[PDB]
Amino acid sequence: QVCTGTDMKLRLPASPETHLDMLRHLYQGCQVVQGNLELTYLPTNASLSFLQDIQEVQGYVLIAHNQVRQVPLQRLRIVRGTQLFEDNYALAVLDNGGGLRELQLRSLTEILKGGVLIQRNPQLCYQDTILWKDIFHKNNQLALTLIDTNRSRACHPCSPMCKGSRCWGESSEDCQSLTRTVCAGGCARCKGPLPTDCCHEQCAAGCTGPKHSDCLACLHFNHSGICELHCPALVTYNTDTFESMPNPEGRYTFGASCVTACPYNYLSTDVGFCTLVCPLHNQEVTATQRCEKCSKPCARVCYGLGMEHLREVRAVTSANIQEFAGCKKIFGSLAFLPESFDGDPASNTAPLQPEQLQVFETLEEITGYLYISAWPDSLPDLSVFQNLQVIRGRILHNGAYSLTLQGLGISWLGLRSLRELGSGLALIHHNTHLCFVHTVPWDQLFRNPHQALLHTANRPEDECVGEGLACHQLCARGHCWGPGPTQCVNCSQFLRGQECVE
């Protein structure tokens, strides 16, 4: 029902051959996009039906570089704009030149933060007749709007049935619904001219009815369809007797909604906030994980890429490789790029040697993502990560992937202890020699139904079956990571150390 967006931000798809599959997995069934809705480099005739349930986008909506003549975003209602494209635009429609014809954002009626950028769409006909000041929030009138009207297409007139000559398309139902401007009273959203039609303060993007339950969208926090300023607290305060007591109606805060229980792969705080990182002076404990204060001073934590000093660091290099020595859990991500194993003439960074990768021998959990686009050609497997068990995926590469392996010379995967990909997708593609990709029970590693494995251009199964590469005769269910007795997922018989032995 809820899903996270992508951080591609106009960059080219890493795997174009599976780009469409990634979007379908990320958005099939999703109603609330907790992030940016980015629809880019989509080919002509692409089946985008999976987008038809999306109602609310938390970040920005970026439609760009597409040849699809239409995008099925009709149900979409509110773009909160909590994250913006170029920092100024909540809806960005760029370089759709085949190409986008009608925006058809019929239900869109609210943009809480940010403007609109429609540029270089030689087939977009009706983007000029929309009165954007109605969609912008009562507190987002600073929203800049830059719309390019240079359209190659001969533009059909706005539909007769449509009023005010404001249309999202040529269809009669493509007519714009003007909520904010119509209000006679000083109310942000109204059903009509009459004062009674005015929506409750909490209501956003219009209300089907006056009561706060009837809002089409929630300004601050949805609660089972009851919009609220703040989620009900886990504990309430008694004014008479100065005591706090548990609240039976208390709910946890997750994104823009109220949840009865903290969703999987998130941390629940004592205040009731479901987060991805623990607050300051708090540590993650298991009871499901929660953030508990470190009454004793917090122990030294190994911070991965994306966190603290390593926030802007692109990859793991010889400069920062020793920072992960002895760390059994990394709060952050690990990325190995081509320049990781080469030297930078400017920054005087020596190349990473394969002997320096053994600092990850004790690594058991990564809270972010594992991204590998380069690997020492000496090593045929990701065996430095053999003792790695969990990739949480709280931080995702490009906003979508938690495990990505690009263009590697490895012959098999060495992640024999990997049991959980908490969140995100797996992208293993263009590894000409990698064989043991389909012998891994990815369904066992995935925790969410949106999660899937995207793979293309690896060593064909034919070649693996032909040259004798397969799971060992002692593997259970033919699940394994490599050619050896030490690479099985589950072993039929009693084990001798790592080795599975009859």
Ligand X SMILES: *[C@@H]1O[C@H](CO)[C@@H](O[C@@H]2O[C@H](CO)[C@@H](O)[C@H](O)[C@H]2NC(C)=O)[C@H](O)[C@H]1NC(C)=O
What minimum distance in Å lies between the beta carbon of 31 and ligand X? 5
Could you give the strand order of the β-sheet that contains 78-79, starting from the edge strand earlier in sequence? 2-4, 32-34, 56-57, 78-79, 110-111
What minimum distance in Å lies between the beta carbon of 33 and ligand X? 12
Q: Does residue 58 touch a copy of itself according to CB under 8 A?
A: yes
Q: Which residue is nearest to ligand X (CB)?
A: 222
Q: Which helix (H) or strand (E) holds 464?
A: helix 461-466
237 binds, among ligand X, a copy of itself, none (CB under 5 to 8 A by kind): a copy of itself
DSSP symbols for 151-181? -SSPPPPPPSSSSTT-BSSSSGGGB----TT
C-alpha span between 97 and 111 (Å, rounded): 25
What minimum distance in Å lies between the beta carbon of 218 and ligand X? 5
Binding pattern for the stretch 251-280 against ligand X, x by CB under 6 A and - elsewhere: ------x-----------------------
Instruction: Give me the residues paired with residue 462 across strands.
Output: none
Return all residues near 374 (Cβ < 8 A) that are at least 6 apart. Answer: 336, 337, 338, 340, 341, 407, 408
C-alpha span between 360 and 369 (Å, rounded): 15
Instruction: Give me the residues paired with residue 252 across strands.
Output: 259
Q: Which of residues 232-251 bind a copy of itself (CB under 8 A)?
A: 233-235, 237, 239-246
Q: Does residue 293 touch a copy of itself according to CB under 8 A?
A: yes
C-alpha span between 48 and 61 (Å, rounded): 15
Q: Which is nearest to 336 in space by CA: 385, 373, 379, 388?
A: 373
What minimum distance in Å lies between the beta carbon of 328 and a copy of itself? 21
Q: Where are the beta strands (DSSP E) in 277-361?
A: 282-286, 289-293, 329-330, 334-336
Q: Which of residues 69-98 bind a copy of itself (CB under 8 A)?
A: 80, 82-83
Q: Does residue 225 touch ligand X according to CB under 6 A?
A: yes
Binding pattern for the stretch 175-214 against a copy of itself, x by CB under 8 A and - elsewhere: ----------------------------------------
Minimum CB distance to ligand X smaller for 109 or for 406: 109
What minimum distance in Å lies between the beta carbon of 280 and ligand X? 30
Instruction: Give me the residues paired with residue 491 across strands.
Output: 475
Pick one of 107, 176, 222, 402: the residue that binds ligand X (CB under 6 A). Answer: 222
Q: Which helix (H) or strand (E) holds 442?
A: helix 442-445
For 37, the token pair is 């809705």
59 binds, among a copy of itself, ligand X, none (CB under 5 to 8 A by kind): a copy of itself
275 binds, among a copy of itself, ligand X, none (CB under 5 to 8 A by kind): a copy of itself
Q: Does residue 55 touch ligand X according to CB under 6 A?
A: yes
Pick one of 62, 124, 218, 491: the residue that binds ligand X (CB under 6 A). Answer: 218
Minimum CB distance to a copy of itself smaller for 96 or for 265: 265
Name the 3-class secondary structure at 396.
coil
Q: Which of residues 189-208 bind ligand X (CB under 6 A)?
A: none
Query: Strand 267-268 to strand 274-275: parallel, antiparallel, or no bridges (unpaired)?
Result: antiparallel
262-275 burial by CB neighbour count: b if 16+ within 10 A, else e?
beebbbbbeebbbb
Pick one of 45, 152, 224, 353: the residue that binds ligand X (CB under 6 A). Answer: 224
280 binds, among ligand X, a copy of itself, none (CB under 5 to 8 A by kind): a copy of itself
Q: Does residue 261 touch a copy of itself according to CB under 8 A?
A: no
217 binds, among a copy of itself, ligand X, none (CB under 5 to 8 A by kind): ligand X
User: Contact residues for a copy of itself (CB under 8 A)?
Assistant: 34, 58-59, 80, 82-83, 229-230, 233-235, 237, 239-246, 253-256, 266, 269-271, 273-277, 279-280, 285, 292-293, 295
